[PDB]
């Protein structure tokens, strides 16, 4: 579960699940600004 909200993003799930999702998002978004 990954929640985009204005001014932020909240990932829910096991720690590793997130670390990995962040890396995925690390490949597709440079800044969290652009992310949302």
């Amino acid at each position: 579960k990954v929640h985009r909200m204005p001014k932020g993003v909240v990932l829910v799930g096991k720690a590793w699940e997130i670390r990995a999702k962040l890396k995925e998002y690390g490949r597709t978004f440079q800044y969290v600004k652009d992310w949302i």
Binding site: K1, H3, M5, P6, K7, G8, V9, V10, L11, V12, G13, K14, A15, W16, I18, R19, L22, K23, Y25, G26, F29, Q30, Y31, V32, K33, W35, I36
Partner: protein
């Protein structure tokens, strides 16, 4: 619908600080037995409790009064809390109203079915025996009345601030830390609460790191996971909420790098709620709020 309730003086300040920090998405309620102090709350909702009991004069650091105050205003409170999906009950323990009314209030919120997170400070040691005993008795009672109780040891504020910051600033920082405690979470709900709920019991301890510069996200996260507010080892946590906040310059390289630092330090199979939030009012500052529950 998430309500942050500042109960008594400790909470009054936090809620002020929150408001001062333009923490969005929450309805604030400042609750106090002390009409004078209460009129200082920047809350839109100022609920004087124990008006009949204390006549606006407060609870005199008697938790029993704060309690009887809150019990007296048991109906006014539920009215104010109804509809709340989540209620932060923020208060200073050791006092009368904070110590006494917050459990009443939090318990009401908990009965209302709202995810009740108490976020309270345990008095500085220096506040003396009465403050320490009453809070202890009070924190004990908050635990029974909330889903999750983040308890911020003020004594640990003194480790963090410069050894020479005057007492007034030490108290002030406790207020901010209380605000930091609630914003750390409320900023992540502005999402199934049963996620957060599954993370909300037992007591909780939180940590914060703030850092600026080239290596900040890691600096921040290292300072967060190691922070004096965070008294036990995170590997001991069954659940961990992590909040990363930074300027528009917050990069996922920074975000995950902090997340990796918090994550490595937590158990591998840990449940985690993690968010990064952009605070336009930040420049090169970054703030990691880590809240561990277990």
């Amino acid at each position: 619908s998430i309500k942050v309730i500042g109960v008594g003086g400790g909470g009054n300040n936090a809620v002020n600080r929150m408001i001062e920090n333009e923490v969005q998405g929450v309805e604030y309620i400042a609750v106090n037995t002390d009409a004078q102090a209460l009129n200082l709350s920047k809350a839109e909702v100022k609920m004087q409790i124990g008006a009949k009991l204390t006549r606006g004069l407060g609870a005199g650091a008697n938790p029993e009064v704060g309690k009887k105050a809150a019990e007296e205003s048991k109906e006014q409170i539920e009215e104010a809390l109804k509809g709340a999906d989540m209620v932060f009950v923020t208060a200073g323990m050791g006092g009368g109203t904070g110590t006494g009314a917050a459990p009443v209030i939090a318990q009401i919120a908990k009965d209302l079915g709202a995810l009740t997170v108490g976020v309270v400070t345990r008095p500085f040691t220096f506040e003396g025996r009465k403050r320490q005993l009453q809070a202890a008795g009070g924190i004990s009672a908050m635990k029974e009345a909330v889903d999750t109780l983040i308890v911020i040891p003020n004594d640990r504020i003194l480790e963090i601030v410069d050894k020479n910051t005057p007492m007034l600033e030490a108290f002030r920082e406790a207020d901010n830390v209380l605000r930091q405690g609630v914003q750390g979470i409320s900023d992540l709900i502005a999402l199934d609460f049963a996620d957060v709920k599954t993370i909300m019991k037992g007591s909780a301890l939180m940590g914060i790191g703030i850092a600026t510069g080239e290596n900040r996200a890691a600096e921040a996260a290292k300072k967060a996971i190691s922070s004096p507010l965070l008294e036990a080892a995170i590997d001991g946590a069954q659940g961990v909420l992590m909040n990363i906040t930074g300027g528009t310059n917050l990069s996922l390289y920074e975000v995950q790098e902090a997340a990796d630092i918090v994550a490595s330090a937590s158990d591998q199979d840990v449940n985690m709620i993690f968010g990064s939030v952009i605070n336009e009012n930040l420049k090169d500052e970054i703030v990691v709020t880590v809240i561990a529950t277990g």
